[PDB]
Amino acid sequence: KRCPSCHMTLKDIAHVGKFGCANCYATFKDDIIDIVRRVQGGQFEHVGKTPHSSHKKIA
């Protein structure tokens, strides 16, 4: 099993501990949120920055 765009195994990205692309999130988000919660305290409830283009159109 591999990524569509990177064609890179998720045990592989777990070994380097890095991030391929948006598709890697779209297909491995469960493990991504899991490891972020495991390492960086317990604050996986994330609020980001107020973006621009998204809400420029959606609100």
Binding site: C21, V39, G41, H52
Partner: protein
């Protein structure tokens, strides 16, 4: 001799006597890119050229300084000015954009980002943040970035997921270091989950001369919260440092005056000065200037500490002729 002893002048190097324990401030903004397959993991020049051209025509108002047309001399000359990290020079596809006014920067294809960095004045971090925001509107307007809704942006796991912010301050702390009061306070500040970092050069300086404080978790929080927290944590220490200084001034005064003037006397009239000694002696004479002892000049302290670096002299002559050149520029600029 080199042209890099006055071409840097800015507010943050000039007006640094009112609050002399702070030297400068940093803020970063790391964010990845869409419609590209992990901009760094690649085989050839092609992803590099694509991202480089994209970000280049994204903003025509700036100018480029590529890695290919630069010899190692200029590379280290710019590394020692805090515009590069080593993994950039280790990257054949890397490049750098700048502003000729030299208050902002962009490290294209450095490591998993583009990293709009901004260094500057001592008054507030908020003005720098506003300038970076007034760049960010343009960048995110001209292109689509890999934004997420549940999480924030999406750059790299252990460092930046929520937002790419990472702020820092540059501090001069000689008193607590001559008195061995840094490990205790390091534990005290780690209590919250912050960190204190090394220096211009070697991360083995025991007597201070510089320090750097930074955040640890840009995750699951807002921006201004971390800004204010760091400001309050760095206001706690400047007071602790200003309290021990008054103690030493009223209590002994003579060991202090002796050390200060003796180091000033060694500094000029040596002709054979290595690195460690010149740094130490410079910190001591600056401490003295804060206790009102000498006149000379004092804004130059910032330039002198970055000019004595090996690359600005060693690339031209052998290290023994550079000991004599460091000594020449030290003896010369001081008095």
């Amino acid at each position: 001799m080199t042209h890099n002893i006055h071409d840097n002048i800015s507010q943050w190097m000039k007006s640094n006597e009112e609050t002399p324990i702070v030297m400068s401030s940093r803020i970063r903004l790391a964010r990845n890119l869409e419609n590209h397959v992990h901009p760094l993991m690649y085989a050839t020049e092609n992803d590099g050229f694509r991202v480089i051209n994209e970000v280049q025509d994204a903003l025509p108002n700036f100018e480029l300084m590529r890695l290919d047309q630069m010899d190692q001399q200029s590379k280290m000359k710019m590394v020692a000015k805090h515009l590069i990290s080593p993994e950039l020079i280790k990257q054949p596809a890397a490049a750098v954009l700048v502003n000729d006014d030299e208050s902002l920067s962009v490290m294209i294809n450095e490591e998993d980002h583009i990293r709009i960095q901004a260094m500057g004045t001592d008054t507030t971090l908020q003005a720098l943040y506003n300038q970076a925001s007034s760049i960010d509107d343009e960048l995110d307007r001209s292109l689509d970035i890999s934004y997420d809704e549940q999480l924030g942006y999406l750059t790299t796991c252990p460092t930046n997921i929520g937002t790419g912010m990472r702020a820092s301050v540059m501090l001069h702390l000689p008193g607590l270091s001559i008195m061995k009061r840094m490990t205790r306070i390091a534990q005290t500040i780690n209590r919250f989950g912050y960190t204190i970092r090394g220096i211009y050069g070697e991360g083995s300086q025991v007597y201070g001369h510089t320090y750097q404080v930074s955040n640890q978790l840009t995750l699951g929080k807002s921006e201004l919260e971390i800004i204010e927290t760091l400001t309050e944590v760095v206001n706690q220490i400047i007071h602790e440092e200003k309290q021990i200084r008054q103690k030493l001034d009223t209590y002994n005064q003579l060991e202090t005056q002796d050390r200060v003037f003796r180091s000033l006397g060694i500094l000029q009239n040596c002709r054979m000065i290595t690195m460690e000694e010149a740094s130490y002696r410079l910190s001591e004479v600056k401490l003295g200037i804060d206790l009102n002892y000498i006149e000379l000049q004092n804004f130059k302290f910032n330039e002198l500490m970055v000019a004595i670096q090996s690359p600005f002299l060693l690339d031209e002559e052998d290290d023994k002729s550079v000991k004599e050149k460091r000594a020449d520029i030290l003896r010369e600029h001081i008095k």
